[PDB]
Amino acid sequence: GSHMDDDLVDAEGNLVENGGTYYLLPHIWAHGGGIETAKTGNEPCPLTVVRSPNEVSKGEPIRISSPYRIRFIPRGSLVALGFANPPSCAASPWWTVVDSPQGPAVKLSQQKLPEKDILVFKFEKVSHSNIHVYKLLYCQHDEEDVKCDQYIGIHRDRNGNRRLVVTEENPLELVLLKAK
Amino acid sequence: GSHMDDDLVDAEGNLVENGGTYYLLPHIWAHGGGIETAKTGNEPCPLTVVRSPNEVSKGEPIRISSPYRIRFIPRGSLVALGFANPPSCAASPWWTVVDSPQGPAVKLSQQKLPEKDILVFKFEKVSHSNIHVYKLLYCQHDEEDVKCDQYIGIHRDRNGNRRLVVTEENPLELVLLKAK
Ligand SMILES: [Cl-]
Ligand SMILES: [Cl-]
């Protein structure tokens, strides 16, 4: 069963488009907003991917991209995630996971990255009727194959920056909203 | 060693207030939403305490009451738990653990319960970080010196209801969010 039911769908009931721009909206009980950036510690600019604490904000427009020449994004297929309008200090728009003092965290980079470093995300369906909710998987470089066994979660820090990090116990759930 | 945090702490890091309203929510977002009622079996009304399946819902406002003439709830203290807005058919807002073929379950009652029947709950703190997480125990005691080890957990029934029951499966690990 291939199924059209396998492609990602946005909050409006429309197929998620490769290269399209979307807002990533946490689907959990804690109030807040979409995903955006923030400057933490060292960083000379916002290189830390975080969930907005503001509730009226849908966060930053984000591109969901598959290198392959497909119009729609199938679940379980690898994708790169990035900001369509990243901080002037970021080399590229793409998110990447780097081990931080607090553990594997989602950040932007000041140096261009190879394909293998950005194609590390995958959306996993959470069963709901009428709506489409997903969990976000992270898949390190298991050499040549792929290996999605870790999820992305939120780790509130000292200042209250809701940082996106790799979590083994508490994954985020998200809905995708087409950024017009 | 002491340090106030030997009084129950809410989600916002502030001490829990006796007789105040709170939302009992899962530390793990994917587990669902807040606590509410459901009509199960031959119940003529919502007398079964359950966790909401909607991850985004905070559920029912719940009052945490200590039987003492105090303002803040001391850890290790017995508390009564009740819905501030209970179903009309309910004699009182207070939860009680009633035995049943499936085992002991958390229910509301159409008849008034004696203090000894509602003063049976205790919150047990599981460590980690700054956000306080607590397991929930059912304790039927009096004059000893032993750690109560009967926890309340989730058991999903044939119809999907996520019933709160005394069990070792799906132990509840809650955060207490102050309502308003
Ligand atoms: Cl959050
Ligand atoms: Cl839980």
**What distance in angstroms lies between residue A31's CA and the mean position of ligand 1's atoms?**
7
Checking chain B for breaks where C and the next N are over 2.5 Å apart, the residues before them are none
Contacts of A158 (CB under 8 A, 6+ apart): none
B130 and A170 within 8 Å at the Cβ level: the answer is no
What is the CATH code for A1-180? 2.80.10.50
Contact between B48 and B165 (Cβ < 8 Å): no
Residues of B with CB under 8 A from a CB of A: 25-30, 33-34, 55-58, 130-131
Dump the DSSP string for chain B.
---S-SB-B-TTS-B-BTTEEEEEEESSGGG---EEEE--TT-SS--EEEE-S-TT-----EEEE-SSS-SBPBTT--BEEEESS--TT-SEEEEEEE--TT--EEEEESS---HHHH--EEEEEE--SSS-EEEEEE---SS-------BEEEEE-TT--EEEEE-SSSB-EEEEEE--
A135 and B34 within 8 Å at the Cβ level: the answer is no
The three-state DSSP-derived secondary structure of A29-69 is CCCCCCEEEECCCCCCCCCEEEECCCCCCCECCEEEECCCC
B31 backbone dihedrals φ, ψ, rounded to 5°: -65, -25
Amino acid letter for position A13:
G
Joined tokens for residue B126: 């599981």
Cβ contacts of A28 on chain B, cutoff 8 Å: 29, 55-56
B166 backbone dihedrals φ, ψ, rounded to 5°: -70, 110
Cα B36 from chain centre: 10
Contacts of A8 (CB under 8 A, 6+ apart): A15, A16, A64, A72, A73, A74, A75, A123, A132, A134, A176
Residues of A with CB under 8 A from a CB of B: 27-30, 126, 133, 135, 156, 169-173
d(CA A8, CA A17) in angstroms, rounded, equals 8
Residue A158's CB is within 10 A of a number of other CB atoms, namely: 9
Q: Is the dihedral of CA B79, B151, A127, A78 positive or negative?
A: positive
| Interface probe, candidates A25, A29, A133, A151, chain B, greatest B C-beta count within 10 A | A29
Residue A143 Cα, gap to closest chain B Cα (Å): 31
Q: Is A148 helix (H, G, I), strand (E, B) or coil?
A: coil
Ligand with the closest atom to the CA of B26: 2
d(CA B50, CA B131) in angstroms, rounded, equals 23
Q: What share of chain A is helix, strand, coil (3-state, %, to 5)?
A: 5, 40, 55
Ligand with the closest atom to the CA of B27: 2
d(CA B110, CA A140) in angstroms, rounded, equals 55
Q: Which residue has the tokens 């960083």?
A: A43
Q: Count interface pairs A-B at CB distance under 8 A.
A: 31
Joined tokens for residue B94: 């207070």
Residue A175 Cα, gap to closest chain B Cα (Å): 12
∠ CA A84-A46-A92, rounded to 5°: 40
Contacts of B42 (CB under 8 A, 6+ apart): none
HSE (CB half, 13 Å, CA atoms) of B34? Answer: 19
HSE (CB half, 13 Å, CA atoms) of B165? Answer: 18
Q: Which residue has the tokens 């297929």?
A: A77
Cβ contacts of B28 on chain A, cutoff 8 Å: 169-170
